[PDB]
Amino acid sequence: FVEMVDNLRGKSGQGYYVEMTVGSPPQTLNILVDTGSSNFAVGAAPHPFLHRYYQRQLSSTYRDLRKGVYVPYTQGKWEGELGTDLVSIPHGPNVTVRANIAAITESDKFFINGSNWEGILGLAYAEIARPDDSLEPFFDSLVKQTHVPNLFSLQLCGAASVGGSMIIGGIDHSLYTGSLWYTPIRREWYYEVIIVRVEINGQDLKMDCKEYNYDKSIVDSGTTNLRLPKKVFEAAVKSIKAASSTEKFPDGFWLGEQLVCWQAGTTPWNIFPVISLYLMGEVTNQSFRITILPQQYLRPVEDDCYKFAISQSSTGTVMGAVIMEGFYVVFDRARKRIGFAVSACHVHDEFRTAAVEGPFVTLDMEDCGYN
Ligand SMILES: CC(C)(C)C#Cc1ccccc1-c1ccc2nc(N)ccc2c1
Numbered sequence: 001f002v003e004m005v006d007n008l009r010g011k012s013g014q015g016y017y018v019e020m021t022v023g024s025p026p027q028t029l030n031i032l033v034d035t036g037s038s039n040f041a042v043g044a045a046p047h048p049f050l051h052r053y054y055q056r057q058l059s060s061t062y063r064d065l066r067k068g069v070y071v072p073y074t075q076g077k078w079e080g081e082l083g084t085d086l087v088s089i090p091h092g093p094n095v096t097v098r099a100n101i102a103a104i105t106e107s108d109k110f111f112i113n114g115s116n117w118e119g120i121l122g123l124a125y126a127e128i129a130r131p132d133d134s135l136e137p138f139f140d141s142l143v144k145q146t147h148v149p150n151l152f153s154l155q156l157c158g159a160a161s162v163g164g165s166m167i168i169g170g171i172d173h174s175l176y177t178g179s180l181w182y183t184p185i186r187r188e189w190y191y192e193v194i195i196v197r198v199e200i201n202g203q204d205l206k207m208d209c210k211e212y213n214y215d216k217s218i219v220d221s222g223t224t225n226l227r228l229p230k231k232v233f234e235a236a237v238k239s240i241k242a243a244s245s246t247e248k249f250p251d252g253f254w255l256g257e258q259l260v261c262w263q264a265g266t267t268p269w270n271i272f273p274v275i276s277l278y279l280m281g282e283v284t285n286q287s288f289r290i291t292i293l294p295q296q297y298l299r300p301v302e303d304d305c306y307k308f309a310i311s312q313s314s315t316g317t318v319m320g321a322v323i324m325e326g327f328y329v330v331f332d333r334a335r336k337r338i339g340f341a342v343s344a345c346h347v348h349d350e351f352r353t354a355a356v357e358g359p360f361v362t363l364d365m366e367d368c369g370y371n
Contacts, residue, residue: 001170006165007091007092008164009116010162011115011161012302013224013299013321015224017032018030018091019089019090020121021089023056023058023059024059024085027054028052029054029119030117030118030119031120031121032119034123034221035154035220036220036222037122038126038137039102039135039137041120044080049111049114053104054103054118056083059086063084065082069081073109076110080102080103080104081105082135083103084099087101087138095142095146097145098145120222122137122138123137123138123152123331124189124191125190128189139333150333150334152166152331152333153170153330153339154166154331155176157345158321171330175328175343175344176328177341177344180341181339182337182338183338184280185333185336190216190218192217193218193279194213194279194280194366195217196209196362196368197209200236200273200274200275202276203243207231207232207235209364210367210368211229212229214231217316217317218317218318219319220320222320223321225318225321226310226322227311228313228317229313229316234312236275236310239273240310243272246268256307256310259306260306260307262304270351272294272298274293276292280366284365287360288356289355289358290323292323292354295348296309297310328342342355
């Protein structure tokens with residue numbers, strides 16, 4: 001799939017975007033790739049932050065669904081009107097499809113000042129599509145209307161100015177080394193998965209594994225951070241603090257409430273512990289583990305100061321860029337599973353490496369799930 005290689009651009013950490021065209025004739029827009037939601041939504045109005053936006057008036061293939069949609073978030077919101085039109089991906093498969101489109105017409109704290117993207121492509125499932133599950137997500141429509149296989153894979157490389165690849169409909173074996181290992185998708189809403197064991201420097205966090213997936217663990221390209229439920233984060237940072245005692249740091253840094261700065265060229269990564277997540281394997285009692293380095297979780301902000309890219313959540317575990325930038329991630333929707341392999345472009349020093357190792361024995365994996 002050379003056509004699709006390197007078809008993602010972005011800034012740290014404003015997320016990854018792919019080029020898309022909408023309407024007849026094609027209107028080109030940068031759209032953020034987001035496996036954490038299910039709406040295909042674009043700016044339709046001249047907000048000051050946007051470089052461009054959907055002009056429905058120019059498109060003869062536009063159909064009004066006469067239905068509004070309101071998406072509130074933690075603070076801030078986006079609001080738009082629903083429609084269908086002809087969507088294509090110039091650096092993707094060679095097809096045009098008719099998809100639902102939310103024309104954004106009011107937002108707060110949604111678009112980023114300085115970013116280069118004008119909408120969002122929700123790659124996840126219908127159950128979490130706003131307003132409700134009848135609003136068929138983009139990917140369900142591609143697969144329903146063409147011969148494109150029901151899967152996609154993501155390689156997000158870790159560096160303003162980041163890049164990557166979204167392979168629609170297949171796997172490019174040149175993008176990863178070693179072997180894929182698959183975790184089943186627990187439920188088709190988000191890409192929800194079960195984490196069965198957490199290590200830091202290969203030392204167990206020894207928590208009831210139900211806590212790791214409370215109320216949810218998901219794989220999510222739209223989130224920058226590794227987000228852990230509070231207990232888990234508490235125990236994880238407590239463990240990281242310990243493992244990294246060669247140098248001390250203010251108590252606010254670990255809450256991500258300030259930055260931490262060193263001289264150019266002088267960062268000591270070895271003070272810092274590898275983080276291992278074990279994920280439910282394909283077979284009963286079988287698991288595998290993924291392993292990230294500090295280069296993934298200590299991420300430089302350029303305005304050398306790094307931010308601690310692991311934070312707490314009440315929404316569950318979120319395996320954001322921090323995790324995904326180490327691995328080639330296959331979203332195998334056809335077989336209800338997600339595959340991980342060591343990415344060919346992942347940021348690594350000469351000592352260590354991101355790893356996908358298996359198999360391991362883990363009992364009661366299904367009990368780590370929340371009900
Ligand atoms: C992508 C940013 C974080 C800039 C946003 C936003 C936003 C604003 C108002 C209403 C909804 C959202 C929104 C939309 C999609 C999302 N996807 C995710 N994976 C995580 C969070 C998301 C939040």
